[PDB]
Structure 1
C-alpha cells in the first residue's frame, strides 16, 4: 500500500510499457496504404521485385538469389533493377508522400 491508506496499492501504478500506443498504431495502418499506392507506381515487375526483396504483403522475405530463381532473370540483374526502382521513388513526386514518414 502507498499513501492515503486508500485502494491505491503499488501494483495499480505499474503501467504497461509493452502496449503500443494507438497514436502509432494509426500510422502503422497508414504506412501500408502509402507504400501500397507508391508500389502501385513502379512497373509491375519492379513492384514485384521490391515487394519480394522485402516482406511486403508476403511471408518472410526473399534472398536476392531466390528472387532471381523465381523471376528466371537472375543474380546481379535484380540488384540493378531494385536500385533503379529505389531511384524512381528517390526524387520527389514519389518522394513527398514517403519522406513525411521518417521523423
Structure 2
C-alpha cells in the first residue's frame, strides 16, 4: 500500500512546473533525509517566504483537483 501510494504520488509530482515540484518535495522531507523549511526555501530558491505559502496553495489546487484525486481517494479511508 505504501509503495503503490508513493509511486502514484511521484507520478503526480512529475506533471508540474519545476520549482513547484522540487519545493514541495524538499519542503516536506520527501525523497531525502532532509527536512527543509519555508525560511530555508527562502534561503535556496529566493528569500520570498509566503509567496511559497501561496504557491503551496496553488499547487494544492493544481493537484487535488478530482481528476487526479482518485488515486489518492482510496487513501482517504486510511
Category of TM-score, reference length = shorter chain: 0.7 to 0.9
Note if contact 1:38-1:94 (Cα within 8 Å) is conserved in structure 2.
yes
How far off is 1:60 after superposition?
2.8
Unaligned runs of 5+ in 2: none
- Structure 1: state its 5+ residue gaps: 1-26
What is the root-mean-square deviation in Å for CA atoms of aligned residues? 1.3
Following TM superposition, by how much is the alpha carbon of 1:73 offset from its aligned partner in structure 2, in angstroms?
Answer: 4.7
Contact 1:53 1:63 in 2 (8 A): yes
More contact order relative to length (CA 8 Å, sep ≥ 6): 2
Give the superposition deviation at 1:49: 1.2
Residue pair 2:26, 2:34 contacting (<8 A) in 1 also:
no
CA drift of 1:46 comes to 0.4
Q: TM-score, normalised by structure 2?
A: 0.87
Taking the aligned partners of 1:73 and 1:41, their CA distance within structure 2 comes to: 25
4+ residue runs of structure 1 moved beyond 3 angstroms? Answer: none
**TM-score relative to the length of structure 1:** 0.68
Structure that is richer in helix per residue: 2
Write the deviation string for residues 7-56 of structure 1: whole angstroms up to 9, x where unpaired.
xxxxxxxxxxxxxxxxxxxx111111111101112211100111021111
